[PDB]
UniProtKB/Swiss-Prot annotation, chains A, B:
The keyword Cell cycle applies. It comes from the Bacteria. One of its GO terms (biological process) is cell division. GO terms for molecular function: identical protein binding. It comes from Neisseria gonorrhoeae. The gene is minE. Prevents the cell division inhibition by proteins MinC and MinD at internal division sites while permitting inhibition at polar sites. This ensures cell division at the proper site by restricting the formation of a division septum at the midpoint of the long axis of the cell. Belongs to the MinE family. The chain holds residues 38 to 81 of 87 of the full protein. This is Cell division topological specificity factor. Keywords: Cell cycle, Cell division.
Amino acid sequence: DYLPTLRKELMEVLSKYVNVSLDNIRISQEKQDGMDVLELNITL
Amino acid sequence: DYLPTLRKELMEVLSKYVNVSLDNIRISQEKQDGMDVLELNITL
């Protein structure tokens, strides 16, 4: 609900920075070592 | 000049989403397989 939405928001912001589409952007939400870590990747 | 700036911009946007500081955000710019891949990480 919360972060998942913010993750989409991050994608949109990035797509505007390098003027690509959302299909070229990947973002993952994972729980490791007890913590919730977001990872946002893009290939240019 | 270009992406390095956008990388900082990404950090700022993320810090506002989860209302943290820039010190809790990491972002890397690396060349792998001939391509330039940005990686933005945050621990929550």
